[PDB]
Amino acid sequence: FGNSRADMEASGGNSFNGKGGANASNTFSGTLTVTVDQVLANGNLHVVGEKQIAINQG
Amino acid sequence: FGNSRADMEASGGNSFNGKGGANASNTFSGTLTVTVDQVLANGNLHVVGEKQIAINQG
Known part of the structure; x- marks a missing residue:
C-alpha cells in the first residue's frame, strides 16, 4: 500500500x-326551435333546424 | 481508467x-309586431314583419 x-x-x-398530459373541454347554452323532417x-x-341572426354588421 | x-x-x-380555444356569443332583446302571410x-x-325608425340622422 505504499x-x-x-x-x-x-x-x-x-x-x-x-x-x-392533455385536456379538452367545451360548453354550449341556448334555445332553438327545430322541425320534424322524417x-x-x-x-x-328526425329533426333539423336553423336560426340566422344579423346584428348590424355580419 | 487512467x-x-x-x-x-x-x-x-x-x-x-x-x-x-374559441368562443362565441350573442344576445337580442326587444318587441316587434308581425303579420301572418300564409x-x-x-x-x-308563417309570419313576417318589419319596423323602421329614423332618429334625426339615419
Missing part, C-alpha cells in the same frame, strides 16, 4: 424525469 | 406546449 498505490476515489450519477320506423323523429 | 479515459458527462432536454297545411302560421 506510494498511494492502492488509494481510490470514484463518483457516479444518473437522472431522468419525464412527464406529460318519422322513423319505431316512432323516433 | 488518464480520464472513462470519465463521462452528458445532458439532454426536450419540451413541448400547445394550446388553443297558413300552412297543419295550422302553423
Whole structure:
C-alpha cells in the first residue's frame, strides 16, 4: 500500500424525469326551435333546424 | 481508467406546449309586431314583419 498505490476515489450519477398530459373541454347554452323532417320506423323523429341572426354588421 | 479515459458527462432536454380555444356569443332583446302571410297545411302560421325608425340622422 505504499506510494498511494492502492488509494481510490470514484463518483457516479444518473437522472431522468419525464412527464406529460392533455385536456379538452367545451360548453354550449341556448334555445332553438327545430322541425320534424322524417318519422322513423319505431316512432323516433328526425329533426333539423336553423336560426340566422344579423346584428348590424355580419 | 487512467488518464480520464472513462470519465463521462452528458445532458439532454426536450419540451413541448400547445394550446388553443374559441368562443362565441350573442344576445337580442326587444318587441316587434308581425303579420301572418300564409297558413300552412297543419295550422302553423308563417309570419313576417318589419319596423323602421329614423332618429334625426339615419
